[PDB]
């Protein structure tokens, strides 16, 4: 599915497998929260992002 639709012209499309354990996330892998711990601001937040 990812190979067939890798060249979609209007938007983005992505196929993923379900997470191994229900209730611990939307998918497998890692989930990090980047935190504005110094109040750099939304523009600086998007720059660092």
């Amino acid at each position: 599915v990812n190979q067939h639709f890798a060249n979609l012209d209007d938007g983005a499309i992505m196929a993923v497998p379900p997470p191994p354990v229900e209730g611990l996330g939307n998918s497998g892998g890692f989930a990090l929260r980047l935190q504005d711990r110094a109040g750099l601001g939304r523009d600086a937040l998007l720059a660092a992002r």
Partner: peptide
């Protein structure tokens, strides 16, 4: 109103997946 002229080839697709100066295949 400004910034375009007749005959210009504008891209109407894949805009989010294209960076300035990148090479593309026109359909």
């Amino acid at each position: 109103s400004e910034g375009l002229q007749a005959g210009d080839k504008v891209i109407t697709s894949s805009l989010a997946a294209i960076r300035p100066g990148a090479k593309v295949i026109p359909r």
